[PDB]
UniProtKB/Swiss-Prot annotation:
Residues of the full protein shown: 814 to 1100 of 1124
List of catalytic residues: D128
Disulphide connectivity of cysteines: none
Family that this chain belongs to: Belongs to the protein kinase superfamily. Tyr protein kinase family. JAK subfamily.
Binding residues annotated for ATP, in chain numbering: L15, G16, K17, G18, N19, F20, G21, S22, V23, K42
Protein name per its UniProtKB record: Tyrosine-protein kinase JAK3
Disease connection: Severe combined immunodeficiency autosomal recessive T-cell-negative/B-cell-positive/NK-cell-negative: A form of severe combined immunodeficiency (SCID), a genetically and clinically heterogeneous group of rare congenital disorders characterized by impairment of both humoral and cell-mediated immunity, leukopenia, and low or absent antibody levels. Patients present in infancy recurrent, persistent infections by opportunistic organisms. The common characteristic of all types of SCID is absence of T-cell-mediated cellular immunity due to a defect in T-cell development.
Highest taxon of the lineage: Eukaryota
Subunit relationships: Interacts with STAM2 and MYO18A. Interacts with SHB. Interacts with CD69.
Modified residues (Phosphotyrosine): Y83, Y118, Y159, Y160
Length: 275
């Protein structure tokens, strides 16, 4: 059931890209009559090693808040996952902003936090937590996706040091990630603070992390952002944001990783704000 034959996967369209790969919508149609199930299929476009690691990570994750691994097709050639037609949260928020209230945003925040608490329990660092990497199962259910940059922490080391600087938009990176290429479950907490900001602005482009940080900012942009952050400057409270939600973002944005709340400490606080 977890082995998908290449010849039966029928290409339909492109779903997206990210981290030198692509996601396609395919029908797994062994009958050849267009009645088979729709699946989301990820493939590559040393890269093979990081793709194999991603598959092994996702295959061992079992959560209502993490995108479901279905299987693999060999040539490992492709990663097969459940298809979520509503797509990424970032685009969903922009389209349905006039229908989703603060209660719904708090529900999504709590579900992402629960998925992140579970990833941390698995010693998994996501490294790319952003609304563009969160999928919408339904109007009341979100799931974390894209484990392309994810790392498993060894048993005796609670952080990870990357050899070369990242290729992701710099606006979600923690100061220790921007300065020393250090990543941990605490830098995932920083990124979650940016996710909370994204939810509460409904991913509005005009006040996005990139537009707002550029606005606030011969020195490179990365060094200028680090300077901004080291001074204690932070993204402003989104328009109409409840005061308590903004206070949580600021806690996620503590200068030192050790002072940031844990996902287990954040969870009951978001659950309390939701109700
Ligand atoms: C998060 C991200 N990369 C990945 N993995 C970034 C670009 C993109 C575009 C489409 C989808 C997608 N859409 C619908 N159902 C799905 N199931 C699994 C993935 C998926 C996911 C992604």
């Amino acid at each position: 059931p977890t082995i998908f034959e290449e010849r039966h996967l029928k290409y339909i369209s492109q779903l997206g890209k990210g981290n030198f790969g692509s996601v396609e919508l395919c029908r797994y149609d062994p009958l050849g009559d267009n009645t088979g199930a729709l699946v989301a299929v990820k493939q590559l476009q040393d890269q093979q090693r990081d793709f194999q690691r991603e598959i092994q990570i996702l295959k061992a994750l079992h959560s209502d808040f993490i995108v479901k691994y279905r299987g693999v097709s060999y040539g490992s050639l492709r990663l097969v996952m459940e298809y979520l037609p509503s797509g990424c949260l970032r685009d969903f928020l922009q389209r349905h902003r006039a229908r989703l209230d603060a209660s719904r945003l708090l529900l999504y925040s709590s579900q992402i936090c629960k998925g992140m608490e579970y990833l941390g329990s698995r010693r998994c660092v996501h490294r790319d937590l952003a609304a563009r990497n969160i999928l919408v199962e339904s109007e009341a259910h979100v799931k974390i996706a894209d484990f392309g940059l994810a790392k498993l922490l060894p048993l005796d080391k609670d952080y990870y040091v990357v050899r070369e600087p990242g290729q992701s938009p710099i606006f979600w990176y923690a100061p220790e990630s921007l300065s020393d290429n250090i990543f941990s479950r605490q830098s995932d907490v920083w990124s979650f603070g940016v996710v909370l900001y994204e939810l509460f602005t409904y991913c509005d482009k005009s006040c996005s992390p990139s537009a707002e940080f550029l606005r606030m900012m011969d020195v490179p942009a990365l060094s200028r952002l680090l300077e901004l952050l080291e001074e204690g400057q932070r993204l402003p409270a989104p328009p109409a944001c409840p005061a308590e939600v903004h206070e949580l973002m600021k806690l996620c944005w503590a200068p030192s990783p050790q002072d940031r709340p844990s996902f287990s400490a954040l969870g009951p606080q978001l659950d309390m704000l939701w109700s």
